[PDB]
Symmetry: none
Subunit: 80 residues, 5 copies
């Protein structure tokens, strides 16, 4: 098929692969400094602001915690 299901616009370029959680939530970091949690249907579940661009994919722990590094120098642990 190859058609578009949906698109979600962030404020700046996305430089790292998205990560999919166990429940289907798609997590993606943007150069706009936010980590976005997007539902399978394309709506926004939540966004988490860091002070600078996120250049690397987040990882998910056993309990669902999402860990992501930021250019602001912090490692964040986010409740899913």
């Amino acid at each position: 098929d190859g058609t578009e299901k949906w698109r979600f616009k962030t404020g700046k370029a996305i430089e790292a692969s998205p990560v999919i959680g166990e429940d289907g939530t798609i997590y993606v970091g943007s150069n706009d400094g936010h980590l976005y949690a997007i539902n399978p249907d394309g709506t926004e579940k939540w966004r988490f602001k860091t002070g600078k661009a996120i250049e690397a994919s987040p990882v998910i722990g056993e309990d669902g915690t999402i860990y992501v590094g930021s250019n602001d120098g912090h490692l964040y642990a986010i409740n899913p």
Copy 2:
């Protein structure tokens, strides 16, 4: 067989590898700022 199945255009370079969902949906980020969900 090396042939093209389809192509999906974004507005800028795609710098990161795509990922595939459980149902086959293909997710990819673009330098144009969007996360795309593409049907296989």
Copy 3:
């Protein structure tokens, strides 16, 4: 034993890791704008020309489709 088995020349730098399919075919992107399919014995199986350099590894789906991004802004779905 550290010896060379073969080498496959592309026109420009290779910035991303190759991926290996189920049948052993080795896929690699190049800054010369092509996605290469290389046989285990080092010969070329096929090549697919894109628009600009490929900076990220190809991803292979369950049905063997090879997906690859490009600096030309497109995501390509390539048959096995």
Copy 4:
């Protein structure tokens, strides 16, 4: 629900994904030259200093040894 669980500040931008060990320890490299080992509760377990920025994710061997490359040209092997 997208809320912050904790944050851990390093000296400089984190350019690579964190890696999680078997016990839940989160390892992450920083441009400040250190590899950090962060406990699940956000406290620091240890830090390991290299001479230059760490631009790529660490990897863990089967016995727990943590391997990380540095811009200082060295590959380090760190005890858990």
Copy 5:
């Protein structure tokens, strides 16, 4: 306990994550153009020289072949 087990020096910055083979061999690329094979105890097993810097992690095939791309435009296949 966060201590150094060993270190291995290469000529230039290491920009990509190392990979580990089944037998414990640690493979890592380097901007000095070589792919290094390092034993679990930190000693060198062998090295393979390419024309230019290696920016991406090597990939190990089912048959043990180590594949690595170079900025010199070639994809190298190296015997175990």
